[PDB]
Design a protein around this ligand. Structure first.
Ligand SMILES: [Zn+2]
Lengths: 469, 75, 158, 106, 83, 77, 78
DNA sequence: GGATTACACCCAAGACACCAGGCACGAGACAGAAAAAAACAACGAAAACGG
DNA sequence: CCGTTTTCGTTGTTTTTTTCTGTCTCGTGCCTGGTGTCTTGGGTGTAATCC
C-alpha cells in the first residue's frame, strides 16, 4: 500500500499543480478582460421610475365625480379623493395598502401611499416614484362616511383594482426579458412526432398529455384538448439538449435548456422539459421484469427522438446524457437531489426547480464548511458573468469531497476551500463595483492560499530509538 | 480552542462547587474538559446542521437541537 | 399624513403649529408599541380603551371589544427567556379564510416598561381603583400588560 | 369471527389462533408459530355443526369425532377445506396420520 | 468565594465560532441559550463522575486521569492527555 | 407477537450465514432471538424515522428520512 | 430469500412504530438496512461459534454478539 | 305479512399534499463603544521522582 | 508516607483592536390563501333471506 499511496499522492501533487496553474490562468485572464480604461468609464446605475398619469384634461375626469365622494375610475386606474372640495386623482400605482375601521356611525378608511424608507417589496431597480431627496410624499389619507355598505364596496373595488394592476405587471415582466423570437416554420411533409408527452412548466393548471413535433427550425408541443396551448421552441434558442433514461427513475425525460427565456402560459422559463412516466415472490419479481421492459421501451423511443432532434438541427445541437456513476447527492434548492454531471454541464432534471450549470460559464468553485472531521460541506459556483447570482449546492456528503475536488480538476475549474460560509451577496457587489481593482489585488488566486504555511508544529521529544531497560 | 481558558475555568469550578466544597483542579483536567466539551458541541452542531438542511433551511433552530438530542438518546 | 425627508419635518411642523396655535392632545388609556405576535405573525401596537382593544399593524388594524375577550393566559416559554401572553377572542379575528381564535404574543422576560395611565383622577377613583394601578413602575412588560388586560376586560389571567 | 382448526377440529376466533395458536395441535402444527397462510390452511372459518364437549373421556361423541384426547370447547362436525400436501407430508414425518374432517373422506 | 452564574462566560462569539466550525451559516438567537443549557447538563454529568473518582481515591485534587475515566465511562475516550 | 413469518426469516438467516461457512446449524432459539432483536431494532428505527418526518412537517416517511436518522445515530458515515 | 420480507410485514412494523404514511422505496431501504444489521450480527455469532469449535450456532452466541454490539437482550439465558 | 338485511354503486367529504403572494424580521452595510484577548513579569502549590 | 526538584498554575497590569451594537434599508422565507385528487364514508337503490 505505501507505494500506491505515494503514487496516488503524486497524482494529487499533479492535481494541486493543475489547480495552481488554473488560479494563475484566471488571474491573468481577469487582468486581460478588465482594463484601467473601463474602470475610469465607471457607469453609475440609477433607479428607473415607470412614469404614469391619471388624467391629462379635466374633461377626462368622469361626470360621475359630481358627489363630493370617493370615485374610482378602473379604466384609468385612478382613485379620486375629495380633499376640501378638490377632485384629486391618485393612481393605483402610487397607492400602497388600505385599512378599513368602522368607528361608530362613520367608516374610517386610511388609504396608505408609497413612501421611501422600507416601503414596498419592489426592488430598487423600479421605483413607483421619481428619485428625490427634496420630494415630500402623501403617506396616508383617512376618510369617514355615514354610509357603511357603499364605503365597504369602494374599499373592495380599490383592492381589486390593485390586484389586477399587480397581475398585469407580473404578466408583462414574465414576457419582458423574453426576446421576441422568430416564427416556427412548419415542415411541409409528415413531421416526426412523439406522442403521450407531458410538458414542464405546464401551459395550463391542468396536466394534459400532448404530442411533440419536429419542424424545420425547431420543435412544437401541441395539446390535443386545446389548439391554443402550443409551445414552440426554435433550435437557435436551445443551449443544451439532455436525454435521461429510467436507470432508477419512474420517468423518461427530454430537457431543453434555453439561451433566452420563454413565456409558457404565465411563467417565464429557461427550461422546458418533455417527459413520460412508467408507473401504474416470483410473481412480484416478474412484475419488476415487466417494468424493466417498459423502462427499456420508453428509453429507446425517447433517446431515438432526442437523436432525431439533434439531426434536424443540422449539427447546432448535441445530445447529452448524464453520467450516473459520477453523480453526487446535494441540496441546490429545498430538497436533497442527485446532481448528475454530463459532458458540458452539472444537471438535476427529476424535480422542479431544475438545475442546469454550464461548466464553461464557471469562473471559480468554493467549498464551504470544509474543516476538521466535518459531517457535510457546501459547494458554491461563481460565474464568469458577475451579474449572474452564485449557485449553492448544500449538504454534499463529506465522503464525496475528494471525488468533487478531483472532478473539478478534471474539468479545469479552480477551487478553494473554507471553514465558513462566505457571503456572496457582499463579495459579488464589491466585485461588480470595481472588477479591475479586484484582480489588481490578487482576484481569487491570493484567496486560494494553497500553501499550508505551518512550521510552528508542537515541538518534539528527545529523539531516541533505543531500547531502555 | 475557541472558548477561552479562564471563563471556562470559572464555569467548571462553579459547577464543581455543588458536589464537594473547595476542590482543587489539576494541570491537564480543565484542558481535557474543554477539549471534550468543544468536540461534543461541534458534533452536536453537525447533527443540528444536518437536521436544518433536512428541513430545507439554512438556519439552525432550537427544535433541531432537540431532535438531534432525542435521536442521539440524550436526556 | 405627510412624509418630509431630509435633515426638515420639525421646522415644517413648527411653522404650521405657530400659524394657527395647534394644541397637542393625548388619547388611549394605555398604549404598548412594537409587540411581537406569533399568531397572527407580525408586529402590532396595542392601544387599550375603556370598551375596546385596538391592534394597529402595518397592513392590518383590528378592533376587539373587551366583551369578546373570553380568556387571558400568561405562560412562560420552556426556553426560560421568553414569556407568552395569549388572548382567546370570540368571534375569532379574520385575515380572509382561516381565522385567529387565539392571539399569541411573545415578550422577552428581561423587557421592562414604565407606563402611566391616561386617566383623570376622578375617573380613576370612581371606575378603576383596585382594578388598575395609576402608574406602573419599571416592571416586566408582560406583567403590566396582563394586569391592564385583567382590569379592562374583567377576565381572570390564567 | 371464529375459525375451526382443521386438524383437531376445535373452533376459536381466528385472531385467537394467530395470537396464541391451537392449544391441542401446537405439538404438531405450531399454529402460533405459523403465518396467516398456514393458520388458514389449518384453521378454517367455513365450517358446520358447532359441538360443545364437556368430558372428553366419557363422551361417546368425542370418541366418534376423535376429539376425546383434546381440550374441551367449541368443535365443528364438518370443516371446509383440507390440509395442504406439504403440511400433510410434514405431519406424516412426525408419524401422525391425518384423517380429514371435511366429510368427503369417510 | 462562591461563583454565581458564570454560564454567561460562554459569550455569543464562542457559540458562533463553534457553529462555524460545525458548518452552520445562519444561527437563530434562541440557540445560544439552548447550547448553554446543553453544555451545563453535559459538564454536570461528566464532573459528577470525575468528582466521584476523586473522592473515592480519598484525594482532594481532581486529576486528569479522573476526567479520563469519567469520559471513558460514557464512551468518550480522549487521546492526548494520558490513557 | 412477532410480525415476520418464521420460515422466511429462517431462510434469510440461512442464506446470509451460508456466505461465511457452509454446513452451519442454528438452534431455534437463536433464530427467535435474532428475530426479536431485528424487529426491536427496526421498530426503533421507524420511530426515529417518524420523528424526522414529523420534523420536516410531513406525514410520509421517505428514504432520505431513514438515511438522516441513521446518519444522526452514527450508523452510516 | 430477501424477498421473503414482504411489503405487508414492513407496513406492520411501521404501524407498530407509529408511522401513518409510507413511501414506495421504504421497503427496499428497509431491506437493505436489515440485511446490513443481520450481516454484522451473524458474522459476530459465527465468529463466536468457530472459536468455540462448534458447527451449530447456539443462543449464547447470539446473546454475546448482541452484547458485543450493545443490544443487550433479556430472556434467552443471559 | 313483515321485517331486517346483503350487496353494488353513486354522490360526496377529510385529508396530505402543490403552487402563489406578500409582509416583516432577519441579513447586509456602516460608524461607534466595549472588554475579550494578547502580552508582559512574579510567586509558589503541587506534580513527578525517589527510598 | 516523607522528602526532594522545578513545571506551570494562579495573580495582577497594561495595551490593542476584533467583536458587539446602534441604525437604516431591502429581501427572502415564513405564513395565509387557493387549489388537486385520492381514500374513504354515508346513502340510495336493487335485490334478498327468514319466519
Ligand atoms: Zn388444532
Amino acid at each position: 500500500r505505501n507505494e500506491t499511496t505515494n503514487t496516488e499522492e503524486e497524482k494529487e501533487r499533479l492535481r494541486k499543480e493543475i489547480q495552481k496553474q488554473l488560479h494563475e490562468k484566471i488571474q491573468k485572464e481577469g487582468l486581460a478582460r478588465f482594463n484601467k480604461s473601463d474602470a475610469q468609464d465607471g457607469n453609475e446605475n440609477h433607479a428607473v421610475f415607470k412614469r404614469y398619469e391619471s388624467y391629462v384634461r379635466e374633461s377626462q375626469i368622469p361626470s360621475k365625480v359630481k358627489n363630493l365622494r370617493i370615485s374610482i375610475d378602473p379604466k384609468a386606474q385612478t382613485i379620486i379623493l375629495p380633499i376640501c372640495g378638490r377632485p384629486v386623482p391618485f393612481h393605483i400605482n402610487s397607492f400602497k395598502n388600505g385599512s378599513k375601521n368602522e368607528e361608530g356611525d362613520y367608516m374610517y378608511i386610511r388609504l396608505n401611499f408609497n413612501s421611501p424608507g422600507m416601503g414596498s417589496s419592489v426592488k430598487k431597480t423600479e421605483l413607483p416614484y421619481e428619485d428625490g431627496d427634496d420630494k415630500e410624499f402623501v403617506r396616508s389619507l383617512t376618510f369617514r362616511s355615514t354610509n357603511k355598505e357603499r364605503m365597504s364596496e369602494v374599499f373592495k373595488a380599490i383592492t381589486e383594482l390593485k390586484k389586477t394592476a399587480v397581475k398585469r405587471d407580473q404578466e408583462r415582466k414574465t414576457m419582458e426579458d423574453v426576446v421576441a423570437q422568430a416564427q416556427l416554420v412548419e415542415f411541409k411533409g409528415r413531421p416526426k412526432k412523439l406522442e403521450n408527452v407531458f410538458v414542464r412548466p405546464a401551459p395550463d393548471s391542468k396536466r394534459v398529455t400532448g404530442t411533440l413535433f419536429i419542424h424545420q427550425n425547431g420543435i412544437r408541443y401541441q395539446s390535443p384538448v386545446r389548439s391554443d396551448h402550443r409551445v414552440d421552441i426554435l433550435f437557435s434558442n436551445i443551449k443544451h439538449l439532455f436525454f435521461q433514461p429510467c436507470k432508477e427513475e419512474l420517468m423518461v425525460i427530454i430537457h431543453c435548456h434555453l439561451k433566452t427565456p420563454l413565456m409558457i402560459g404565465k411563467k417565464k422559463t429557461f427550461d422546458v422539459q418533455f417527459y413520460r412516466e412508467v408507473s401504474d415472490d416470483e410473481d412480484e419479481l416478474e412484475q419488476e421484469q415487466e417494468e424493466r421492459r417498459r423502462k427499456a421501451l420508453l428509453d429507446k423511443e425517447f433517446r431515438r427522438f432526442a437523436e432525431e432532434i439533434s439531426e434536424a438541427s443540422n449539427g447546432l445541437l448535441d445530445l447529452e446524457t448524464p453520467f450516473r456513476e459520477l453523480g453526487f447527492t446535494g441540496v441546490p434548492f429545498r430538497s436533497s437531489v442527485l446532481c448528475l454531471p454530463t459532458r458540458d454541464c452539472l444537471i438535476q432534471l427529476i424535480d422542479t426547480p431544475f438545475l442546469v450549470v454550464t461548466l464553461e460559464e464557471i469562473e471559480v468553485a468554493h467549498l464551504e464548511r470544509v474543516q476538521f472531521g466535518l459531517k457535510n460541506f457546501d459547494l458554491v459556483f461563481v460565474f464568469k458573468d458577475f451579474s449572474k447570482p452564485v449557485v449553492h449546492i448544500n449538504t454534499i456528503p463529506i465522503e464525496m469531497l475528494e471525488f468533487v475536488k478531483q472532478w473539478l480538476t478534471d474539468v479545469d475549474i479552480p477551487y478553494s476551500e473554507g471553514a465558513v460560509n462566505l457571503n456572496w451577496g457582499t463579495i459579488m457587489k464589491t466585485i461588480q463595483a470595481d472588477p479591475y481593482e479586484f484582480f489588481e489585488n490578487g482576484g481569487w488566486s491570493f484567496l486560494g492560499g494553497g500553501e499550508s504555511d505551518d512550521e510552528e508544529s508542537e515541538e518534539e521529544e528527545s529523539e531516541f530509538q533505543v531500547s531502555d531497560e | 480552542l475557541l472558548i477561552r481558558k479562564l471563563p471556562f475555568q470559572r464555569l467548571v469550578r462553579e459547577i464543581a462547587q455543588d458536589f464537594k466544597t473547595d476542590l482543587r483542579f489539576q494541570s491537564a483536567a480543565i484542558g481535557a474538559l474543554q477539549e471534550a466539551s468543544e468536540a461534543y458541541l461541534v458534533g452536536l452542531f453537525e447533527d443540528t446542521n444536518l437536521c436544518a438542511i433536512h428541513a430545507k433551511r439554512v438556519t439552525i433552530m432550537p427544535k433541531d437541537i432537540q431532535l438531534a438530542r432525542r435521536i442521539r438518546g440524550e436526556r | 399624513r405627510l412624509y418630509v425627508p431630509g435633515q426638515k419635518s420639525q421646522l415644517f411642523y413648527e411653522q404650521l403649529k405657530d400659524k394657527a396655535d395647534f394644541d397637542t392632545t393625548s388619547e388611549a388609556i394605555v398604549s404598548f408599541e412594537d409587540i411581537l405576535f406569533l399568531t397572527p405573525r407580525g408586529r402590532f401596537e396595542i392601544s387599550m380603551y375603556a370598551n375596546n382593544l385596538r391592534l394597529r399593524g402595518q397592513s392590518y388594524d383590528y378592533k376587539i371589544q373587551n366583551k369578546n375577550v373570553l380568556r387571558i393566559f400568561s405562560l412562560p416559554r420552556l426556553d426560560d427567556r421568553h414569556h407568552l401572553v395569549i388572548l382567546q377572542v370570540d368571534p375569532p379575528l379574520r385575515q380572509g379564510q382561516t381565522r385567529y381564535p387565539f392571539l399569541v404574543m411573545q415578550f422577552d422576560r428581561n423587557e421592562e416598561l414604565e407606563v402611566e395611565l391616561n386617566l383623570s383622577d376622578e375617573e380613576y377613583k370612581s371606575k378603576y381603583e383596585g382594578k388598575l394601578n395609576r402608574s406602573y413602575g419599571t416592571d416586566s412588560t408582560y406583567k403590566i400588560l396582563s394586569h391592564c388586560l385583567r382590569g379592562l376586560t374583567e377576565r381572570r389571567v390564567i | 369471527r371464529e375459525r375451526a382448526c382443521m386438524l383437531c377440529g376445535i373452533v376459536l376466533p381466528g385472531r385467537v389462533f394467530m395470537q396464541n395458536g391451537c392449544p391441542n395441535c401446537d405439538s404438531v402444527l405450531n399454529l402460533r408459530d405459523s403465518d396467516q397462510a398456514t393458520v388458514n390452511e389449518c384453521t378454517s372459518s367455513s365450517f358446520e355443526g358447532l359441538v360443545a364437549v364437556g368430558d372428553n373421556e366419557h363422551s361417546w361423541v368425542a370418541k366418534w369425532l376423535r376429539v376425546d384426547r383434546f381440550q374441551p370447547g367449541l368443535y365443528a362436525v364438518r370443516v371446509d377445506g383440507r390440509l395442504p400436501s406439504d403440511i400433510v407430508a410434514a405431519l406424516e414425518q412426525y408419524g401422525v396420520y391425518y384423517r380429514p374432517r371435511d366429510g368427503s373422506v369417510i | 468565594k462562591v461563583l454565581r452564574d458564570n454560564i454567561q462566560g460562554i459569550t455569543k462569539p464562542a457559540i458562533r465560532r463553534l457553529a462555524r466550525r460545525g458548518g452552520v451559516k445562519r444561527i437563530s438567537g434562541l440557540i445560544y441559550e439552548e447550547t448553554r443549557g446543553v453544555l451545563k447538563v453535559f459538564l454536570e454529568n461528566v464532573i459528577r463522575d470525575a468528582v466521584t473518582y476523586t473522592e473515592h481515591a480519598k484525594r482532594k485534587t481532581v486529576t486528569a486521569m479522573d476526567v479520563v475515566y469519567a469520559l471513558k465511562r460514557q464512551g468518550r475516550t480522549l487521546y492526548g492527555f494520558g490513557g
